[PDB]
Amino acid sequence: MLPPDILENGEFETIYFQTNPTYIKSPIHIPKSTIGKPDTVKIRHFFALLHQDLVVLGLEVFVYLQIYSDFVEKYVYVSKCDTVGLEKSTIKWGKVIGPVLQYIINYNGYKIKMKNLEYRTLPKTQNLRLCVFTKPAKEYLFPNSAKNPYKNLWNGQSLLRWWISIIDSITKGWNNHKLMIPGADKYATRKFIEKYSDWSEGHIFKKDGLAVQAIPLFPDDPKGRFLELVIVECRYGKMTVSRFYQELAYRQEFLLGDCVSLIGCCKENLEVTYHDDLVSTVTISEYKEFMNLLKLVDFSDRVEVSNFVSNYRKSK
């Protein structure tokens, strides 16, 4: 999951666990007329890097498996990524996030139970979709960490350049690499990807039809927050994909934001082999319990951070 260069024989330690694969309703609205509706299985991935007894880096990724008869539409959604900054870093965190995210993208050892009415076998043909949004918040995962002396505080453009470099390195040979900065003109968006030959402006989802039937609603996604409003306000039967992205540029999160951008990459018709890889798997409640404890930690306080790490090491 990580190179020996990064883990110096235990000076560093990883927290990594998945939720048990859980059936959910589709994040992309399928009609009820829809013929051949897929089953959607969601897996949460949490990764954290530890240096001695302190958290230094965190990454949360959600994997959605839209299981059809002959293939899987596999969506990999980066939920949150953050650093702590209590110590002088010494490590370029892209050299950790990259390999970890690539591991999560390519993981195919899920223990999926059969749909009711022993483990379900996934189709081998899988179409990958990697979905990332960039928005320079101060503390995505680690509260009060923006106060730390060695935390790098992104601006919108530097965070986008950082994510483009990471995603490009782990999506080599993929069918497309799409970047959209809602509200920016094409020339400004093109500047970020001028040195990336495989990247183009736009998005990866279906270009026409209703937006709710093409664009997935991910949790805590600026894109998804507008999709939520379209559904609540009952505009889901009228707003096209084109009109959605047009109006997305005028949302407060984007128009008042700092280079808030949306990245998508696809790889089509990848033959995957099932390969179990024994990792820590937890119930959803145990996952949320961990995440709720992490939200109550003062990550400006080495005492509270070391205590949180100590309590997790006890629970395994």
Curated annotation (Swiss-Prot):
Residues 1-316 form the Rtt109-type HAT domain. The active site is at D221. Its main location: nucleus. It comes from Candida albicans (strain SC5314 / ATCC MYA-2876). It comes from the Eukaryota. Disruption phenotype: Leads to a decreased pathogenicity in mice and increased susceptibility to killing by macrophages in vitro. This is Histone acetyltransferase RTT109. Belongs to the RTT109 family. Acetyl-CoA binds at F133, A137, N152, L153, W154, W162.
